Design a protein around this ligand. Sequence first.
Ligand SMILES: CC1(C)CCN(Cc2ccc(N3CC(=O)NC4(CCN(c5cc(NCc6ccccc6)ncn5)CC4)C3)cc2)CC1
Lengths: 240, 196
Amino acid sequence: YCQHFVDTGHRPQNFIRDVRELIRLKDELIAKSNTPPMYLQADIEAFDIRELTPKFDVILLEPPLEEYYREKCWTWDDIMKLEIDEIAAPRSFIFLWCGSGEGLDLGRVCLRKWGYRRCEDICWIKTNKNNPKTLDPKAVFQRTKEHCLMGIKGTVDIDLIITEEPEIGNIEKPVEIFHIIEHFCLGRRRLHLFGRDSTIRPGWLTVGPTLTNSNYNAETYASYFSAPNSYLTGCTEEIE
Amino acid sequence: LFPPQWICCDIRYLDVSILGKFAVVMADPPWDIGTLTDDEMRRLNIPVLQDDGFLFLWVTGRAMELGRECLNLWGYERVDEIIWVKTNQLQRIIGHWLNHGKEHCLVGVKGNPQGFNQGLDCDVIVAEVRSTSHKPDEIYGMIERLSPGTRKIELFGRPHNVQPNWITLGNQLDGIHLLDPDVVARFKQRYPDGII
Ligand SMILES: CC1(C)CCN(Cc2ccc(N3CC(=O)NC4(CCN(c5cc(NCc6ccccc6)ncn5)CC4)C3)cc2)CC1
């Protein structure tokens, strides 16, 4: 398949096929447990990360890398200065979209800077069936995937997502990442930094500069996790 | 000497300076995740093996970070990362949080290599899992197309890994098979009695 791509332009991943029905009950339990969607327009460079309370069980972090527009971009310099450790719960999880360049190194630096150990490397493999480009200067090979690093701090699914490559200038990441995250059942304070109108989702607080509306209220948000609901996994029944 | 060559040895104790310079190094180390400790892996004399060229470094688990450390310590910059999507014979996909559908190979550059065909292959291999713990044969075609005809060296290879243009090092190889005259000379000079 490596010879074949050289011959035809079809990435080897184009020929993967097919890309325990109790997953539906879990999905329904996740759906009943989900908080109302909350969202806030905020310029994250200028915003005091700390106003975001309470502490989160899961953080999904999707900074707009310059390489996403090879056709405001955040540098790893900007990202590494985010005070992520200030809003992460002492046992919590991070999912960081790192792209496929220096991000795979600089994103690991961030994870250690904020206090996490990397435990999964989730890989978004992009097919090109519908169109069999220009390389990074440092690139040896043609880049057909992106990496989402999973970090843990404190004490069913594969690590692969396969979808077709989006149209030029579409920055969206596959919504499957949300399914992987929610199926881990890691708790219910879920924050998505640099989300958009298009990523708002039940069970998630979205914070990003391009949101056109906000409904976030820290007191209202905290009330969804007040007792007796403080420690639900997001995968059990609602407390009656 | 184009045909396969190899040296049964302990890569810890072999004076790799006798081997000359290579356009590509590949390694699939037995990380302590017979293994090598982290200090032994840092201490490997990888820097003498190349002036300008590429390093291909298989990693897994916590060696994802350790392999990045070795790669930088040895003088490389990580510039790509190959993943092998493991399938069966029907092209279906086969830490504790997620099942692992893939294996990672770090790609490092040293110096300023010139005349390589960068961009011919993409960074995803899709290939059937042959035997256990074996890497896919597609990596050699990818490496041949990137740097055709050049000298390459594989560290921690096994007898199935031997390839033309390659010199394989590993302690499960059958003896010392060397054909390149410069190599045979420096080998005889450094090991007159034939024992590392
Ligand atoms: C693509 C992957 C999935 C493939 C698998 N990999 C993981 C992996 C699995 C297995 C192995 N190996 C298994 C194997 O049988 N041999 C070696 C280890 C030993 N080896 C040595 C070792 C040595 N010095 C230390 C020493 C010597 C003697 C006594 C103590 C210590 N010197 C010379 N060769 C020869 C090759 C390779 C390597 C990597 C991940 C990615």
